[PDB]
Coordinates of N, CA, C and O and ligand atoms in Angstrom, one line a residue:
Chain A
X1 N -54.2 17.0 -23.7 CA -53.7 18.0 -22.8 C -53.5 17.5 -21.4 O -53.9 16.4 -21.1
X2 N -52.8 18.3 -20.6 CA -52.5 17.9 -19.2 C -52.9 18.9 -18.2 O -53.2 20.1 -18.6
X3 N -52.9 18.5 -16.9 CA -53.2 19.5 -15.8 C -52.1 20.4 -15.6 O -50.9 20.1 -15.8
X4 N -52.4 21.6 -15.1 CA -51.4 22.7 -15.0 C -51.3 23.2 -13.6 O -52.2 23.4 -12.9
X5 N -50.0 23.5 -13.2 CA -49.8 24.3 -12.0 C -49.3 25.6 -12.4 O -48.1 25.8 -12.8
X6 N -50.1 26.7 -12.2 CA -49.9 28.0 -12.8 C -50.1 29.1 -11.8 O -51.3 29.4 -11.4
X7 N -49.0 29.7 -11.4 CA -49.2 30.9 -10.4 C -48.7 32.2 -11.1 O -47.8 32.1 -12.0
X8 N -49.2 33.3 -10.6 CA -48.7 34.6 -11.1 C -48.7 34.8 -12.6 O -49.7 34.5 -13.2
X9 N -47.7 35.3 -13.1 CA -47.6 35.7 -14.5 C -47.7 34.4 -15.4 O -48.1 34.6 -16.6
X10 N -47.4 33.3 -14.9 CA -47.5 32.0 -15.6 C -49.0 31.7 -16.0 O -49.3 31.1 -17.0
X11 N -49.9 32.1 -15.1 CA -51.3 31.9 -15.4 C -51.8 32.8 -16.5 O -52.5 32.4 -17.4
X12 N -51.3 34.1 -16.5 CA -51.8 35.0 -17.5 C -51.2 34.6 -18.9 O -51.8 34.8 -19.9
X13 N -50.0 34.0 -18.9 CA -49.4 33.4 -20.1 C -50.3 32.3 -20.7 O -50.6 32.3 -21.9
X14 N -50.8 31.4 -19.8 CA -51.6 30.3 -20.2 C -52.9 30.9 -20.8 O -53.4 30.4 -21.8
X15 N -53.5 31.8 -20.1 CA -54.7 32.5 -20.6 C -54.5 33.1 -21.9 O -55.4 32.9 -22.8
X16 N -53.4 33.8 -22.1 CA -53.2 34.4 -23.4 C -53.1 33.3 -24.5 O -53.8 33.5 -25.5
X17 N -52.4 32.2 -24.2 CA -52.3 31.1 -25.2 C -53.7 30.5 -25.5 O -54.0 30.2 -26.7
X18 N -54.5 30.2 -24.5 CA -55.8 29.6 -24.7 C -56.8 30.5 -25.4 O -57.5 30.0 -26.2
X19 N -56.8 31.8 -25.0 CA -57.8 32.7 -25.5 C -57.4 33.5 -26.8 O -58.3 33.8 -27.6
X20 N -56.1 33.7 -26.9 CA -55.6 34.5 -28.0 C -56.5 35.7 -28.3 O -56.8 36.5 -27.4
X21 N -56.8 35.9 -29.6 CA -57.5 37.1 -30.1 C -58.9 37.3 -29.5 O -59.5 38.4 -29.6
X22 N -59.5 36.2 -28.9 CA -60.8 36.4 -28.2 C -60.6 37.3 -27.0 O -61.6 37.9 -26.6
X23 N -59.4 37.4 -26.5 CA -59.2 38.1 -25.3 C -59.7 37.4 -24.0 O -60.3 36.3 -24.2
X24 N -59.4 37.9 -22.9 CA -59.8 37.2 -21.6 C -59.8 38.2 -20.5 O -59.3 39.3 -20.6
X25 N -60.5 37.8 -19.4 CA -60.5 38.5 -18.1 C -59.6 37.8 -17.1 O -59.8 36.6 -16.9
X26 N -58.7 38.5 -16.5 CA -57.9 38.0 -15.3 C -58.5 38.6 -14.1 O -58.4 39.8 -13.9
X27 N -59.1 37.8 -13.3 CA -59.9 38.2 -12.1 C -59.6 37.4 -10.9 O -60.3 36.4 -10.6
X28 N -58.6 37.8 -10.2 CA -58.2 37.2 -8.9 C -59.2 37.7 -7.8 O -60.0 38.6 -8.1
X29 N -59.3 37.0 -6.7 CA -60.1 37.5 -5.6 C -59.6 38.8 -5.1 O -58.5 39.0 -4.6
Chain B
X1 N -61.5 31.0 -6.8 CA -61.7 31.0 -8.2 C -60.5 30.4 -8.9 O -59.6 29.9 -8.3
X2 N -60.5 30.4 -10.2 CA -59.5 29.8 -11.0 C -58.1 30.3 -10.8 O -57.1 29.5 -10.9
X3 N -57.9 31.6 -10.6 CA -56.6 32.1 -10.3 C -56.1 31.3 -9.1 O -54.9 30.9 -9.1
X4 N -56.9 31.1 -8.1 CA -56.6 30.4 -6.9 C -56.4 29.0 -7.2 O -55.3 28.4 -6.9
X5 N -57.4 28.3 -7.8 CA -57.3 26.9 -8.2 C -56.1 26.5 -9.0 O -55.4 25.5 -8.6
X6 N -55.8 27.2 -10.0 CA -54.6 26.9 -10.8 C -53.3 27.0 -10.0 O -52.4 26.2 -10.3
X7 N -53.2 27.9 -9.1 CA -52.0 28.0 -8.3 C -51.9 27.2 -7.0 O -50.9 26.5 -6.8
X8 N -53.0 27.1 -6.3 CA -53.0 26.4 -5.0 C -53.1 24.9 -5.3 O -52.5 24.0 -4.7
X9 N -53.9 24.6 -6.4 CA -54.2 23.2 -6.8 C -53.6 23.0 -8.2 O -52.5 23.3 -8.5
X10 N -54.5 22.4 -9.1 CA -54.1 22.4 -10.5 C -55.4 22.7 -11.3 O -56.5 22.6 -10.8
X11 N -55.2 23.1 -12.6 CA -56.3 23.4 -13.4 C -55.9 23.0 -14.9 O -54.7 22.8 -15.2
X12 N -56.9 22.9 -15.7 CA -56.7 22.4 -17.1 C -56.8 23.6 -18.0 O -57.4 24.6 -17.7
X13 N -56.3 23.4 -19.3 CA -56.5 24.5 -20.3 C -57.9 24.6 -20.6 O -58.4 25.7 -21.0
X14 N -58.7 23.5 -20.5 CA -60.1 23.6 -20.7 C -60.9 24.4 -19.7 O -61.8 25.2 -20.0
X15 N -60.5 24.3 -18.4 CA -61.0 25.2 -17.4 C -60.7 26.7 -17.7 O -61.5 27.6 -17.4
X16 N -59.5 26.9 -18.3 CA -59.1 28.3 -18.6 C -60.0 29.0 -19.7 O -60.2 30.2 -19.7
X17 N -60.5 28.2 -20.6 CA -61.4 28.6 -21.7 C -62.6 29.4 -21.2 O -63.2 30.2 -21.8
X18 N -63.0 29.1 -19.9 CA -64.1 29.7 -19.4 C -63.9 31.2 -19.2 O -64.8 32.0 -19.1
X19 N -62.6 31.6 -19.2 CA -62.3 33.0 -19.0 C -62.0 33.8 -20.2 O -61.6 35.0 -20.2
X20 N -62.2 33.2 -21.4 CA -62.1 33.9 -22.6 C -63.3 34.8 -22.8 O -64.3 34.6 -22.2
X21 N -63.2 35.8 -23.6 CA -64.3 36.7 -24.0 C -65.3 35.9 -24.9 O -66.5 36.0 -24.7
Ligands
CU1 CU1 -41.8 31.6 -12.6

């Protein structure tokens, strides 16, 4: 795998991919 | 936090796993 530059909706796409059916929390400051 | 880190800097998919349920 490689390092990622992910802003905005692109970060939530990556979260979705990584976590899938486990679900995830998106928690900005 | 990671939302910040991933955007201002870089982050890995492994770091993102921390945010799974
Ligand atoms: Cu874009």
